[PDB]
Amino acid sequence: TRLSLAYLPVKVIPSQAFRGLNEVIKIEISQIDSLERIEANAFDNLLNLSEILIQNTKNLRYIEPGAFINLPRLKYLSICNTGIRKFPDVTKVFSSESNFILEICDNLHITTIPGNAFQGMNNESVTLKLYGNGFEEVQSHAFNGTTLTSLELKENVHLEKMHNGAFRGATGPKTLDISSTKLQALPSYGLESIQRLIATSSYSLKKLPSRETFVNLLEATLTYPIHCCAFRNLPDYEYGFCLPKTPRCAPEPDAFNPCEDIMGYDFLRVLIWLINILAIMGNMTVLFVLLTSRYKLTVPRFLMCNLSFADFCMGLYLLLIASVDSQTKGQYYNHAIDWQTGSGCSTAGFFTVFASELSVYTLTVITLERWHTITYAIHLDQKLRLRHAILIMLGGWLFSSLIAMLPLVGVSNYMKVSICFPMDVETTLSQVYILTILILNVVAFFIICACYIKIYFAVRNPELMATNKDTKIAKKMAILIFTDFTCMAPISFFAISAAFKVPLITVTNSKVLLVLFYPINSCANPFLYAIFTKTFQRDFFLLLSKFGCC
Amino acid sequence: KEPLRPRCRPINATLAVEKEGCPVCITVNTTICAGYCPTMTRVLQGVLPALPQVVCNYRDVRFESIRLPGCPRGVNPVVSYAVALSCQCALCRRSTTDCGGPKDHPLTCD
Amino acid sequence: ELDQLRQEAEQLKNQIRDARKACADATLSQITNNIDPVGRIQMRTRRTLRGHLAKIYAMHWGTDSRLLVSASQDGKLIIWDSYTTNKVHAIPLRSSWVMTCAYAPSGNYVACGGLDNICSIYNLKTREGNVRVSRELAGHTGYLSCCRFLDDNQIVTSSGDTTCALWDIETGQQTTTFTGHTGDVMSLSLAPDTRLFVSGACDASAKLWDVREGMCRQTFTGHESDINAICFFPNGNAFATGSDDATCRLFDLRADQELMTYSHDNIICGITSVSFSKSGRLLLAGYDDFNCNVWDALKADRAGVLAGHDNRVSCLGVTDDGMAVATGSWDSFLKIWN
Amino acid sequence: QDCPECTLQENPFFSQPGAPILQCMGCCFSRAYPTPLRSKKTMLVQKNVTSESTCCVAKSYNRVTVMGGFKVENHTACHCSTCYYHKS
Amino acid sequence: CTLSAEDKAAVERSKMIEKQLQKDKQVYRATHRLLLLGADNSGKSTIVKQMRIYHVKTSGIFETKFQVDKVNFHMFDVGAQRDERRKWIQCFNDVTAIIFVVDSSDYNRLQEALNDFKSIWNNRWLRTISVILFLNKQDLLAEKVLAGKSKIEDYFPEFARYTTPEDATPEPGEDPRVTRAKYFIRDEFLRISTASGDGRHYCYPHFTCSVDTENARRIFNDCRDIIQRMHLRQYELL
Amino acid sequence: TASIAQARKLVEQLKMEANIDRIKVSKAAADLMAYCEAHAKEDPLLTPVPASENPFR
Numbered sequence A: 001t002r003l004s005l006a007y008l009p010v011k012v013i014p015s016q017a018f019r020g021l022n023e024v025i026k027i028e029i030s031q032i033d034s035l036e037r038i039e040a041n042a043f044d045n046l047l048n049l050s051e052i053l054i055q056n057t058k059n060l061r062y063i064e065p066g067a068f069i070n071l072p073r074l075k076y077l078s079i080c081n082t083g084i085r086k087f088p089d090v091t092k093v094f095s096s097e098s099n100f101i102l103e104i105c106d107n108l109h110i111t112t113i114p115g116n117a118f119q120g121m122n123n124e125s126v127t128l129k130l131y132g133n134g135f136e137e138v139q140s141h142a143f144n145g146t147t148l149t150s151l152e153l154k155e156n157v158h159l160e161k162m163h164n165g166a167f168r169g170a171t172g173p174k175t176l177d178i179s180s181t182k183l184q185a186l187p188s189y190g191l192e193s194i195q196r197l198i199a200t201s202s203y204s205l206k207k208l209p210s211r212e213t214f215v216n217l218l219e220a221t222l223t224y225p226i227h228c229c230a231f232r233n234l235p236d237y238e239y240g241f242c243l244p245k246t247p248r249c250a251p252e253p254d255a256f257n258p259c260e261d262i263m264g265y266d267f268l269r270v271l272i273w274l275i276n277i278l279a280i281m282g283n284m285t286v287l288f289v290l291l292t293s294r295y296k297l298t299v300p301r302f303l304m305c306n307l308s309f310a311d312f313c314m315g316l317y318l319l320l321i322a323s324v325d326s327q328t329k330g331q332y333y334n335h336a337i338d339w340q341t342g343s344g345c346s347t348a349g350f351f352t353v354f355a356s357e358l359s360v361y362t363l364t365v366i367t368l369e370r371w372h373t374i375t376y377a378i379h380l381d382q383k384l385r386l387r388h389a390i391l392i393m394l395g396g397w398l399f400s401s402l403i404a405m406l407p408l409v410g411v412s413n414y415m416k417v418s419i420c421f422p423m424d425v426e427t428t429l430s431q432v433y434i435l436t437i438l439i440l441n442v443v444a445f446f447i448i449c450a451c452y453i454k455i456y457f458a459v460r461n462p463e464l465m466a467t468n469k470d471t472k473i474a475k476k477m478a479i480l481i482f483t484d485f486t487c488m489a490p491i492s493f494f495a496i497s498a499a500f501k502v503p504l505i506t507v508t509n510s511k512v513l514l515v516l517f518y519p520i521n522s523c524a525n526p527f528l529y530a531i532f533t534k535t536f537q538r539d540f541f542l543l544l545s546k547f548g549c550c
Numbered sequence B: 001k002e003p004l005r006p007r008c009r010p011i012n013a014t015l016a017v018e019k020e021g022c023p024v025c026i027t028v029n030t031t032i033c034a035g036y037c038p039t040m041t042r043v044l045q046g047v048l049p050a051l052p053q054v055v056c057n058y059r060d061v062r063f064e065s066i067r068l069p070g071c072p073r074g075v076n077p078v079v080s081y082a083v084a085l086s087c088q089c090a091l092c093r094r095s096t097t098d099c100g101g102p103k104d105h106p107l108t109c110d
Numbered sequence C: 001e002l003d004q005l006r007q008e009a010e011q012l013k014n015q016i017r018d019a020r021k022a023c024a025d026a027t028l029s030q031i032t033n034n035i036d037p038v039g040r041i042q043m044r045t046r047r048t049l050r051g052h053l054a055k056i057y058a059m060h061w062g063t064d065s066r067l068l069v070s071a072s073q074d075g076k077l078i079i080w081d082s083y084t085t086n087k088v089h090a091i092p093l094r095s096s097w098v099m100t101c102a103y104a105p106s107g108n109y110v111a112c113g114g115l116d117n118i119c120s121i122y123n124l125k126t127r128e129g130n131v132r133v134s135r136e137l138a139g140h141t142g143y144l145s146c147c148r149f150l151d152d153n154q155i156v157t158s159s160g161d162t163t164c165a166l167w168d169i170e171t172g173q174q175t176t177t178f179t180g181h182t183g184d185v186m187s188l189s190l191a192p193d194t195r196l197f198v199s200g201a202c203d204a205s206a207k208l209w210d211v212r213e214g215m216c217r218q219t220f221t222g223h224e225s226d227i228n229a230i231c232f233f234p235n236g237n238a239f240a241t242g243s244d245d246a247t248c249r250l251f252d253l254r255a256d257q258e259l260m261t262y263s264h265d266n267i268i269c270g271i272t273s274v275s276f277s278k279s280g281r282l283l284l285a286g287y288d289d290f291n292c293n294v295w296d297a298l299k300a301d302r303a304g305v306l307a308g309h310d311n312r313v314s315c316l317g318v319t320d321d322g323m324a325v326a327t328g329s330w331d332s333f334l335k336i337w338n
Numbered sequence D: 001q002d003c004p005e006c007t008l009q010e011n012p013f014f015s016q017p018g019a020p021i022l023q024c025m026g027c028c029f030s031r032a033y034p035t036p037l038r039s040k041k042t043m044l045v046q047k048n049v050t051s052e053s054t055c056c057v058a059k060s061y062n063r064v065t066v067m068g069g070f071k072v073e074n075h076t077a078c079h080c081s082t083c084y085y086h087k088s
Numbered sequence E: 001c002t003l004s005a006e007d008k009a010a011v012e013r014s015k016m017i018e019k020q021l022q023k024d025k026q027v028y029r030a031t032h033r034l035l036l037l038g039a040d041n042s043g044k045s046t047i048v049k050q051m052r053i054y055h056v057k058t059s060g061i062f063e064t065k066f067q068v069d070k071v072n073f074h075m076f077d078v079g080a081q082r083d084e085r086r087k088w089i090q091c092f093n094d095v096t097a098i099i100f101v102v103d104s105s106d107y108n109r110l111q112e113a114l115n116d117f118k119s120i121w122n123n124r125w126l127r128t129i130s131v132i133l134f135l136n137k138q139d140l141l142a143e144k145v146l147a148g149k150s151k152i153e154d155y156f157p158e159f160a161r162y163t164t165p166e167d168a169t170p171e172p173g174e175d176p177r178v179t180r181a182k183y184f185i186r187d188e189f190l191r192i193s194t195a196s197g198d199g200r201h202y203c204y205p206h207f208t209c210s211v212d213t214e215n216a217r218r219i220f221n222d223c224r225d226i227i228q229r230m231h232l233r234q235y236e237l238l
Numbered sequence F: 001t002a003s004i005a006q007a008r009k010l011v012e013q014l015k016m017e018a019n020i021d022r023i024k025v026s027k028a029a030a031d032l033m034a035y036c037e038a039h040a041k042e043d044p045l046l047t048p049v050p051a052s053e054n055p056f057r
């Protein structure tokens, strides 16, 4: 009534070896690595047989086709830990069981799943458990002519692609598990019938089908928290009779990944594009006018050129972000994993860090050299000259490009947030790096303020007539300091507060502080420093005369 | 415990220990774990999914070491085996456990 | 008494004016109309003899057109090789302010002057190559603002004491003094025949002095403001002048009156230097405006404009062969055009 | 600890008055021990432990229906054989 | 580069001369040239002597080469020239600052001095040059005021309708009369100074006597202020 | 007074200047044109020359 074929020195099983048996319910073929071949029709016909197990036959190169044929009551089929290369043949069992289960197991050497592998397999519903197998790909119509209650491709690491037409002829599936499969994308057809989807630890599944394709989806479980946001759209024994109005998706999105677009609020989508343009032309013209100047470059003009270049890099970053927002308008979650972890996000983060640090360092150097020239003004031989300026600015470039490269080297990640700012503060190294950068910016602003105050106290004449000239000095120097402060203080305070793991704001509102307060320097530097000075205006009129538009 | 229907718990056993190339069989007393725990099968086979059914298995396992009596050279002198501390019945981890059917094989070597 | 001599001089001046008007049968433009004007003149900077510290106020070309001199207000008098911008010499001077420079026509000596009231002559073809003061011709009581060499032994200088002075180098004394003048005398020009030379000043009346006779022969007063430069026509029978009122003028020694007046409406900046071309068609002029102008000598047409200077053009010079021209402005750069 | 023989009981969900739907529940054997040396060679994947699993299944059942028209398998006799939905 | 021997020798000469000129340039840019105008009785001779302490009759310019706080100041006393400034002032267009010494004792050669300043201040080439203005021989003014001549109103009648500005800081222990007179002269000069172009070039007044040894500090401070403010326009601060 | 000396010197200077003879402006213009045209061929600026002769590159 039960067959236990174990540890036998059998190399070949002849065809129809089990003829004459009618009361067998179970057949077990386990730990028989001496076995290498099974003849076709080895199980040609049995009445009461329902359960078959093959568990360890490492030397089994393959099973001849038609080994399992014309078995109505065959219900559970298992083939595990076998060195089979050709996919086993099951298309001719012609079973009639209502809940047939087909199990393929630990067959690392199976290369692929042939198309139409289940024609004539069972007249009723079936479940497939393809755990662990080393399939390379699945071709079109691999599932055909049967209601497929459950499909589980769990832990098929070697699997790389499933043909878009694999579900063309199949009904369902009702349950689909692709966990740890590192599959690229799901088939475009047949997913409408899915009730529940499991894709945990499938990091390579960066893109998912549209929400409308998942009409019947309940009880979904994905690997990327962002993907669950696609299901926010409105239309015990867990006994029930009606599906929930909306799917329940896990894991829930984290704080770093709110269910929003890249640009949080609608109005920002405009304000960015304006700050885009205002942040490009001016700094370009400043570069264009000061680089095509007949007259020799003096230290402040070189510093102005480099400051405008840094702000131009900032504007380019903002332009990249705005273009990304425009391209992914309204359905960011689909492209979120692909772009947030692609080269684009890393480039954007590098641009942000490099441009911001270079601009801050250049502003500090400009203020320091202004203070040096105004304090030791009588000693006309101590004036800083172009060679030292170029040396200091090359050092500044190295510092700015080094600090902006560490996130690409693992010290931090630009991939933590959509806007690609270095918000990775988990490990202490990243926390100290971020705090160091923020404190350097704060100290930069403080030294700028101190140098300006010293300039004002040095120019002031405590005895001679200075009542009407000190006021202008104070006024415009306060304008400069206030522009720097309104660009720095909010961003710096919030960043330092959130870098100690005490967030005082949500990431969605963080977006506003980018548009409204971050590029303030990047768009106000050329006007306060470059556009309004006599030298730049005179060069600009020279260019206009050259082009005749004056 | 109860003489009839105890639960998953650790029980002592006599396991045969050898290694790759020892012509001699060693037999040592260590801990395995076995017993019963509730099981389920879904009557409504269909739209509702299948109900998982657990098997008694380890939760924390330590390791003991032993030196065999002059086994052939070329292999590390000291071999190790496992000792079971506590167990509960959960799904057999295929990547870690080989959960098969009735075998009743002797646990002594031959 | 003043009155009778004053009225006699007034009658003499009226007679001179009447004679000149009777002699003004036709102007130059009337007879030049048949001449086809030359096309636009293409002059482009060929060299930029930089490396000079202070603002150049005076330069001059050598006889052979190889070496040139530029003197600045820092005490430097640099001798350049125009071909390869080589600083052939760099003489440091006693008085920082220098307002002129010259050459012995053989090319041996150089001269300089300024607010120190003392002309200084340096020798280049010395023994050990050490350039040192060959002589210091003191005696003037006004700033010396021009220098021109008759030969290697005679120098005719003009200063701000209203009196030109012809010095003998070796003798080092007042060989001759020309004093029939009023106002600061600033510009000297020696005709190809060195017996005559013209001089301009702040009295708006240039004069034609004779080296040997010791007194002026003719006076031309066609200007309205100070005279800043003067130059003979290449044949020596006419000469051009520039004034602060932005009007170039060309007078004749024979006709004894202004032959022509070159002027333009857009120019309200004073002239500082003028020079004819080797043939005479092109008259060059430097202005307080940072550009130089090349005008047709017979048409007054604005033939060409040079705009390669960043400051006032204060000195200009055309080579003897005419192959090139040089201009020095207050930007400390001496630029050669051709 | 206690766990009964897995036997037929009432189904709280679908058992209508006078329509006994019987589903059998309870427990059988399970154990786990380190893989023996004689068995390691026969397995392709390196292993450290084997386990013997037993769950009880309805070796006899019949078709029935409940309000709603859905198929139901009323179990008549179950006994404990291998475990099917037990790997993950 | 492919050159001949003569050309290489010429290039060596050029490079040596260039190095010498570079030395002269680096020493030149560290000196502040300083013009020194004045009149016959202004007393600038005593000034140049009191700056020499801090170190041919046919010539027309002098030298002082005084330095303060290791800063080289060149003071150029243009003397023995004619009484005509209008066109050799062009030569001094690049000086750091102009010094103007005037005598406050000679009631009325004073008026002429005013015109002189109005000529210097409103000149075309000195447009961007600031003027330091020393009022010299203040002690002589003190004696002329304490003598009770009461003829300051005779030459300048506005003295009657003048009042000492409240910003005045007179020394401890002098008659209000001398303070009023000296501040009247200072305000008369400042009226011309502030009339045209004051926002572009400034006028720094001081009261000094021939015996004062503190003038060098006054010029040093004035030059520091002038150069600082000049940096300020190119830094846009003013 | 030196005023009489200056006046006598001035009248003498004008007396000497007046005795000089003049020439018709037409003759002067003709001579200038003849000289300027007879030497217009050799001038390097009226008629520019190629780099073969022009030594300023």
Ligand SMILES: CSc1nc(-c2cccc(NC(=O)CN3CCOCC3)c2)c2c(N)c(C(=O)NC(C)(C)C)sc2n1
Binding pocket: A255, A256, A352, A353, A356, A421, A422, A423, A424, A425, A434, A437, A491, A494, A495, A498, A499, A503, A505, A506, A507, A510, A513
């Ligand atoms: C968290 S650490 C962090 N945070 C911010 C920053 C600033 C403004 C708002 C928020 N908003 C949250 O941080 C919310 N959350 C949600 C929950 O907790 C953390 C993040 C974060 C920045 C920031 N601007 C950086 C920056 O600009 N660096 C350069 C200037 C380019 C050098 S580095 C950095 N690091």
